[PDB]
Symmetry: C5
Subunit: 260 residues, 5 copies
């Protein structure tokens, strides 16, 4: 798009409220138990134990030479306070006499705002991982997945076009594309790593680029994406781990922009 | 409310000092022992083991005293100096703490998962329901996320708009099933940080030189409806781990507020 | 005090160098062994195992509209941080006893205040029933009692930091409802084996002027310094006993003459 | 080179996209098992267990000397957008990792000592020799710090100027015996962070909103000699710990570059 | 210093740069101490010369000027060979019950540098007043030759000038904040048993050495005084489970300019 003047005047700005609920393998914020393939056997995790990118397309007011331009977003991880819970069946500290473990371990927090689906690059820890249908993993055109999927091979790309479909563990945001999307992510590893999350209604993220242009919403659609895996729940007795996801709130400010 | 000019002149600004004491299940800064339901049994924690949001409504000086005035005035919260009081209380290795280095060392200082949170507003803080276990049984008089029919389904573990409340009572709304609602609270400013982990060390700073500005993108602060300033607090520093019993108790700290307000005109 | 113009000209500014040595229960940077009361028995720690606020009043040049010294800025440093790079002085030994001694570790607090009067203290303690030996001073009501409310905020429990080595860190914090004429700065870190992180440079400066460009005004021509620098605990091999370790704080205050009504 | 005016006008700026895949001893993001010499035996690690600097020379558009102009033109690297690709790949607790909570929990995510480093330059990055063990035996075709006589003495464990190299070959210079030479690299900008520890969690961020400025104290960027832009990378995220074997493997990640260059005149 | 400072001479040959490196002095000269030893409770604390890390220090000769003094304006400094620590094969204590790789350098660490126009002023403070430092090391002594309990806190009687490389132990001397008017110093210490070192390296950082009044260190006797203390942590050896201090070299690049002075 050749970008022109910013239309100002009445009915020239609008806000969009939306939330994305987490897709950690089931719909209620927890995966099924995390399983580990035995050395030499297939790496074939259960559908319901594999966290995926949350994604939605919000319909914007119809315009027509004008496109909605995303200027800023207020975003928050909802239900952080839910984790201050040491009674709900957690593995017990101090030889079983203390309280249950709060959510801990490896976690990722990520959001994107765009005028089109987020561009994904294929990269995974184990090229041989078997993702059950209907999940989508990095495949060559011939249907195979070789060792190169553990590093950067441009052959492995996708568009984040379906909720609860693209596993976090084999797709990252493609930095060679996403010209019309703004994305932000932080991953922390470790076995018992404590989650650190902040929440305030005073933060704002500017979405304008080096040249003061925001994401331009093609087909009058605003594209939100989320991945908020706070860590794992560790259950007493079973000592099994479950991925715990949290919902993300969005508040996008858009304005009318003219295009050639 | 259509916001107008900021009235300046004498008696046009005022300060409010307040403190909120913590409500961690009892009134003296400690919960009763944290209990854990056995797998397959009801998750039914004791009233006195469940930390709640502290909350108060401070009465502000009367405004629309002048029966001739052409414009209504509301107090506008501009800035707050806030401090977590008694942080230094935690430098204590003699008061019955689980003992380090095979029992020959000093007692454990407060450690583990902690949350620190405050809000200033012109009305009660808007809460969204979200909890780790939808089936948790909160004893009366605590209030948890319920649908209109009285039930609580699996959706309460993620975002379902059906689960909302106003933080209208002290020591009543559990921290673990209510968070600030980011879809509302237009007339409140809230700030929170949570840290998880089993033995995580609390890190807290204290100074009388910090100030938090409460004005929004458009230079408007919280406007105090009914001449009431609404303070909220949640300062669970971590857990006390007791020697011998090896039981854990939530430890809360009080929060000090110093709000600067000014008169603002409204249509 | 109604504050007026800042007197400028010769002999209108001065600097004060001072150090506060730590008061961790003895005078040489270590407490006696930390003891823990048995559940159900009195919580009665030894005088020499309880760290206290360090405090001094520096005498300023006599001045006498009246003039008061105004504290503008302070360069401050925690002295002897490098002293902790020591793995040979009797520390509990790592890697099954074959490695070096534990460096100072565990819960620590670092705090300083500059003021024109004694620092205002608020009473708050972990255990209301703690018995502080004389001559230490703990939160008492006027009647001499100490109730459960001392574990949260009760305004009845206040004091002025008017004596060195007297006010325990564990039952007194800076009172944020007062200290209009003091500037205080403090950071506490908990944990059992938490590593201390301390920096030192002669390039840092802390401005002491308030929202209205007024610094602490030194009443009775006295500058009031306060310190609490408990770097952590020393863990001794064999005994596996813990001792509080304190460090001294250096102050360099710049003051200027200010007029008052 | 005497640096002159910045040529502006049409065809005077250009961008370069590139990626460097990691060289951790094999080409698919993992080393072979990390081995440890027995005390008193040779320190002789396998070729395929030794991570190396990734490196490439990107060809820039040829800049043709104008016999009427008084001044030659060189490409000047102004800014770089760079990202560590496939960070999200590490949120994997099913792919054969050593299992937590006595073997009943999920596999360990990548953890332990890690280094993240990138350089942009108008020539090969200048390397200084420094290694933990001077006696380490690097198999051919790797290149380690050698004196002219072929030996490597104790001084290679500190700074000896005799041990220098140019990062002129991919997958060749081990990270563990070469660092960026701060006494040179006038025409390169380099950025690195190392974290030690046994089980240290990696912390990595990713966004398409970050930019690193490459201009120096005097507003001059790397000047690309022979119309070549020199990229270097070292992104060892940590180790994979395998269940049962309890063997460790270095895990590398690819780095994306997006360099903005402009024409600069030189005497 | 006690020099009255005047105008900054500008013009040709009025600025110069100095490149230098200080190699670490952790008790031997090749980046490692001998094994760390621990006195038994009740016995003398008498560590080996070669197990005690010391401040690195050098005096660089500047071009002769004559009044004019060289003024240190800025320094680019870097800890060299950080990447050397990404080594899990060189005899380190082995992780995951001995089946994993060797421990990288870990534990308590200090990183420190100073630039000055004279030797760095040191204050005596030590963890154990009774520590016995072998000759030729220099520890805090009173004039009478003794060292009392006061050396564990601040006693002004215990001072020294960092006038010799590999001589002043880090563990009993810190920079004296009551002096060093003509030096700029910067240090960070981290404790703990297994604490991971975190070090960054870039040729884009610069540290300004000018004070509150835009005056840098003035190099007395046409000498620039560099000091370093970079103990990255300890090496933990498999089988022996003994610990060795590991030091790293520091690179300096100082920019100086001519400054005029009275008297
Ligand atoms: C990643 C993976 O391959 N998971 C597999 C698990 C793991 O072996 C468990 O960890 C056993 O504890 O076992 C299965 O039999 C199962 O539970 O259905 C098959 C499944 O494909
Ligand atoms: C969270 C919860 O449900 N707590 C329950 C506990 C836990 O199961 C104990 O930790 C093990 O008995 O048990 C009770 O008998 C109790 O102690 O009062 C009932 C209570 O409902
Ligand atoms: C660094 C080093 O010298 N490693 C040597 C190792 C290790 O001692 C063991 O693998 C212990 O893990 O032993 C070898 O037989 C091997 O595996 O190839 C030879 C190799 O040269
Ligand atoms: C700091 C110190 O005083 N170290 C002493 C050590 C340690 O006690 C042992 O290495 C640990 O048992 O013992 C010595 O015999 C030695 O190693 O030469 C004398 C030495 O003076
Ligand atoms: Cl939605
Ligand atoms: Cl009050
Ligand atoms: Cl208790
Ligand atoms: Cl906060
Ligand atoms: Cl501080
Ligand atoms: Cl593998
Ligand atoms: Mg009336």
């Amino acid at each position: 798009i050749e970008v022109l003047d910013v239309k100002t005047g009445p009915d020239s700005t609008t806000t969009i409220e939306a939330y994305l609920n987490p897709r950690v393998g089931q719909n209620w914020g927890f995966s099924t138990e995390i399983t580990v393939a035995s050395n030499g056997y297939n790496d074939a995790p259960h559908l319901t134990e594999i966290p995926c990118y949350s994604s939605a397309r919000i319909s914007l007011p119809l315009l027509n030479l004008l496109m909605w331009e995303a200027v800023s977003v207020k975003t928050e991880v909802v239900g952080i306070s839910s984790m201050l819970n040491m009674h709900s069946y957690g593995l017990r500290a101090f030889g079983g006499y203390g309280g249950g473990y709060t959510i801990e371990g490896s976690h990722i927090h990520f959001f994107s705002v765009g005028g089109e689906p987020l561009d994904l690059q294929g990269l995974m820890q184990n090229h041989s991982t078997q993702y059950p249908s209907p999940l989508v993993g990095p495949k060559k055109p011939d249907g195979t997945t070789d060792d190169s999927a553990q590093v950067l091979n441009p052959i492995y790309k996708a568009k984040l076009d379906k909720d609860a479909t693209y596993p976090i563990e084999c797709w990252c945001p493609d930095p060679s594309r996403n010209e019309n999307s703004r994305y932000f992510g932080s991953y922390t590893g470790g076995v018992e790593t404590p989650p650190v999350l902040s929440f305030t209604n005073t933060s704002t993220t500017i979405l304008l680029d080096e040249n003061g242009v925001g994401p331009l919403c093609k087909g009058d659609g605003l594209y939100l994406s989320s991945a908020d895996v706070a860590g794992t729940f560790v259950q007493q007795t079973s000592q099994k781990q479950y991925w715990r996801g949290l919902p993300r709130y969005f508040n996008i400010t858009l304005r009318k922009r003219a295009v050639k």
